[PDB]
Design a protein around this nucleic acid. Structure first.
Lengths: 177, 113, 60, 86, 138, 53, 122
RNA sequence: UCGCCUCCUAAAAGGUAACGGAGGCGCCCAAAGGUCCCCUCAGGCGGGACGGAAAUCCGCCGGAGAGCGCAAGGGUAGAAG
RNA sequence: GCUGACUGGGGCCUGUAGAGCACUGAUAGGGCUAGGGGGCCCACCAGCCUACCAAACCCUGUCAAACUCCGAAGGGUCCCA
RNA sequence: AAUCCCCCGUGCCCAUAGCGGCGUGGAACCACCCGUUCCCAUUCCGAACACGGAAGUGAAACGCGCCAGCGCCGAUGGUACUGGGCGGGCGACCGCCUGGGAGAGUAGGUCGGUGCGGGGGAU
């Protein structure tokens, strides 16, 4: 929301209350603006997972938002971001995630639990059409048991920008199995 | 590797072999069907159609003669041009009796070879 | 042909060799005096490099 | 009457290769470029190599000496403009 | 920042004998964690300990993933006196690069663990920073 | 040089007597008595050179 | 274009190779395309250590001459199943291996654009 | 421990100690020499003899990772091979 | 006797710091897998399953002066000033 | 004759040309082809190299065209490193001021472009 500025002036903006991010959208890029404050609040809600936008000069209050950053530096305090928009019926670069709930099988009985190298998914279902929250958990958890890509179980928007057999989640001995 | 190297058959390089110098890649280029020869002489040179089995209709003398004459010929259109001694470029093959042929071509041509 | 006038400050004493060279170069003798040169980069360079070495003012 | 072990302790010694003349300088049928001795010089300049591009040294006379596979066995001539009728 | 001889020549290519990388558990959201900001050839053993220490205080869920590893080595005393130094080796460590992603306590809601790492923390050797990752912790 | 009764013995050759000789090092290694190659005595030019010595 | 897929003789190989001198002569009489190919290893499973010995014999026969053989000898053989294998090729007897040749085949020898032989044509 | 060959160290030309790092040499090869003629590796995969590591042959895949007497580094199949 | 350190320009070299992984050697969570297991028909069975060790290839991840597909900071040199 | 299609030899540009997936072409082209006394030639057959010729064929190597899967390339702004200049910690080290400013990281890009000639094809 809001986020402004766009001349050419880093060092100082990179100082105070306005961290700098690039205005990026296939074909065009204009001088960063926006401000570490806003960032805070919303990236807060969910950078590269939810998705809103700004109203600069009403401009083209379109979505996408960030497709590159790093809360960078040492302090763990970000500066210099990458914003991109998609008013197009092409949205493919889609990274939102999926969850479970804690299906009592390995855990609530065997202590046993899981490794979720996954969590997040980068694919491309229906453009400007992705659940701000995708849930997927056929439960199942214990012994030397493991699950991934393939099996997965995908809803509507049929993409899968990724690949079969890989990093979903598995059960491992929290102590033993 | 390198383009030509992952490929093969070639030795365009012994081509270079001559590239060093000696005047012109009087290069015999062959595809049974016919043969056609050109002249690549160092300095990002060029050529001058000196010999081809089509610049004067693909007779019906087949190899032997065919090469004999087209050669002699090239040699001459060439001297017309104004060269002197040229240098043999086995476009490919082990100077096959065919090449042999084009070769005396320059030979008799006068085309020093 | 902007005409640059520079005045000498914070002594070479120790400060780098070549640098000392930008000094005799520009033409730089005793202390805290001032000299002048056409914008001409070459000139311009020797001096801005030694930078701090003194003060650079715009006139003719 | 002998030497020992478990004491690596072994300096090494000198050499002195180079890009002697460097590209585009008063050319003079002389040790062209070097990083490989028993060289077999070549024509004017070189530019083939395990990186791509190519080198032009605006100076020519008979020829120079190379570096076995480093640098570049010149051959793609360049006698340079300063080689026209006096 | 002096370092080892040749990793196949002084002392090079081990197993830095230690105590592996993952204990703790899963989850999709809450990043609960440990990172530091000092600079040092992190003390093999030391570390190893510290770490398994945490393990010790806990036992299960709460990603005790630990992002560190000692891979080069120190040396001193073994031969004639003080002048000409042959070379006794000890001290396998790693360059804690003045702050960075150390070891995590990752999970939905298990503060039991958080505290635990804490423990592991007080533990460790060079002050280290106690923290949260991309969202907070829950 | 370093007289080594090791498979390394110095030897030279003659031009049928083109007159003198020229410089070679050799190995019993293989082929014993064997030793023929051609050269150029101050004598004229070329000539058959036997190497044994 | 059935005028494709449907085959045409491309490589038949007949041989043998004891760790060992003329048996290959027997070969010779049998055919007409010699095959002096050194064999290897370094151990005693047959007293085969001499790591470097002429001992592998292989009478290559594609098409033509291979026809003389497919004929003359195909009779003495007796299985006709199993010893059939995958890449469209098979083998049997005291050292025999043949290779079918669907039309994609040849692409495979090219130093250039060597299409990794689509397991759909072969 | 004292001479020489390679590597790092040299902070990006070239070049520096150190009782700093590791490691090779005081040979050879009459043919690894000259040149002309031809060959295109290891390795993986699949299929068969004496063969169940580890060949032999055949059919694919291949910035060459094999290879070069001997050590390292350079190279580089267009080949030194 | 304007030829010199230096500064402006323009070629043309190095290839530490950085950074990275496909060259190499590390290396950690991990998955595919087959080598050892290991429990089951007792078991030449080479048939079975599976919770410990692994090679190898994969995804997530890391380090290197004698690793680098990457690439500055800068220094070099000829010339034009 | 010295205008464009096209194929053919073929040259510069060291993958924005490689992979592979479908496809198209033979009159013209080219290859594949046919056959093997003689040239020359396989450590073994002229499979490759070969000499001599239709018919057969576009299958195969091949040329443009479509496809982003791999692959290659690759910016903006952007961080580390730093030339230089000055400040803060006994500290390993922290910071600032002034030109330089890689890779990797999403756009996104490409499936050549271009030399000369020879054959045609456009009265």
């Amino acid at each position: 929301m809001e986020l402004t500025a766009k001349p050419r002036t880093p060092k100082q903006k990179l100082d105070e209350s306005m961290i700098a991010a690039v205005a990026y959208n296939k074909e065009n890029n204009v001088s960063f603006a926006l401000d570490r404050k806003a960032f805070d609040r919303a990236f807060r809600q969910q950078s590269t997972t939810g998705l809103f936008d700004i109203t600069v000069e009403g401009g083209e209050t379109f979505p996408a938002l960030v497709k590159a950053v790093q809360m960078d530096k040492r302090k763990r305090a970000p500066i210099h971001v990458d914003f991109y928009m998609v008013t197009y019926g092409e949205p493919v670069e889609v990274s939102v995630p999926v969850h479970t709930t804690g299906r009592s099988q390995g855990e609530v009985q065997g202590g046993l639990v899981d490794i979720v190298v996954h969590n997040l998914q980068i694919v491309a279902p229906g453009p400007r059409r992705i659940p701000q929250e995708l849930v997927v958990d056929v439960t199942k958890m214990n012994i030397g048991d493991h699950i991934t890509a393939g099996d997965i179980k995908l809803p509507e928007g049929c993409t899968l920008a990724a690949d079969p057999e890989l990093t979903v989640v598995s059960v491992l001995p929290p102590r033993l199995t | 590797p390198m383009r030509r190297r992952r490929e093969a058959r070639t030795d365009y390089h012994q081509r270079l072999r001559l590239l060093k110098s000696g005047k012109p890649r009087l290069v015999a280029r062959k595809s049974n069907k016919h043969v056609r020869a050109q002249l690549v002489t160092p300095n990002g040179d060029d050529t001058l159609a000196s010999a081809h089995s089509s610049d004067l209709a693909e007779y019906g003398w087949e190899p032997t003669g065919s090469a004999y004459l087209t050669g002699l010929l090239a040699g001459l259109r060439a001297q017309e041009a104004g060269v002197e001694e040229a240098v043999l470029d086995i476009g490919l093959n082990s100077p096959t009796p065919k090449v042999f042929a084009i070769q005396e071509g320059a030979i008799d041509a006068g085309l020093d070879i | 042909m902007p005409r640059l006038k520079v005045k000498l400050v914070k002594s070479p004493i120790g400060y780098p060799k070549d640098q000392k060279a930008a000094l005799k170069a520009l033409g730089l003798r005793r202390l805290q005096q001032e000299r002048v040169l056409e914008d001409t980069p070459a000139i311009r360079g020797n001096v801005e490099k030694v930078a701090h070495l003194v003060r650079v003012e715009v006139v003719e | 009457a002998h030497k020992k072990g478990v004491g690596s302790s072994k300096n090494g010694r000198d050499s002195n290769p180079k890009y002697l003349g460097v590209k585009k300088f008063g050319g003079e049928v002389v040790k062209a470029g070097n990083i490989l001795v028993r060289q077999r010089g070549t024509k004017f300049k070189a530019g083939q190599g395990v990186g791509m591009g190519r080198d032009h040294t605006l100076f020519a006379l008979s020829d120079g000496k190379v570096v076995f596979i480093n640098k570049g066995k010149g051959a793609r001539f360049i006698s340079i403009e300063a080689a026209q009728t006096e | 920042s002096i370092k080892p001889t040749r990793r196949e020549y002084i002392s090079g290519i081990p197993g830095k004998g230690i105590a592996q990388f993952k204990m703790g558990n899963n989850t999709y959201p809450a990043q609960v964690e440990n990172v530091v900001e000092k600079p040092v050839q992190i003390r093999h053993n030391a570390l190893e300990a510290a770490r398994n220490a945490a393990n010790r205080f806990v036992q299960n869920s709460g990603k005790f993933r630990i992002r560190k590893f000692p891979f080069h080595v120190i040396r001193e005393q073994d031969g004639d006196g003080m002048r000409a130094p042959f070379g006794k080796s000890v001290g396998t460590a790693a360059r804690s690069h003045g702050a960075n992603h150390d070891f995590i306590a990752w999970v939905n809601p298990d503060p039991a663990v958080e505290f635990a790492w804490r423990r592991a923390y007080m533990k460790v050797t060079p002050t280290v920073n106690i923290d949260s990752s991309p969202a907070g912790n829950a | 040089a370093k007289d080594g009764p090791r498979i390394i013995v110095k030897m030279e050759s003659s031009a049928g007597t083109g007159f003198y000789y020229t410089t070679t090092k050799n190995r019993r290694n293989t082929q014993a008595k064997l030793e023929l190659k051609k050269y150029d005595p101050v004598a004229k030019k070329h000539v058959v050179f036997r190497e044994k010595k | 274009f059935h005028e494709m897929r449907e085959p045409r003789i491309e490589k038949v190989v007949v041989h043998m190779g004891i760790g060992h001198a003329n048996a290959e002569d027997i070969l010779g009489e049998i055919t007409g395309q010699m095959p002096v190919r050194t064999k290897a290893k370094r151990t005693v499973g047959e007293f085969d250590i001499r790591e470097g010995d002429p001992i592998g014999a292989k009478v290559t026969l594609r098409d033509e001459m291979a026809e003389e053989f497919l004929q003359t000898a195909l009779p003495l053989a007796e299985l006709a199943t199993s010893q059939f294998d995958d890449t469209g090729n098979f083998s049997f007897g005291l050292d025999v291996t043949v290779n079918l040749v669907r039309p994609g085949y040849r692409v495979a020898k090219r130093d250039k654009a060597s299409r990794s032989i689509p397991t759909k044509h072969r």
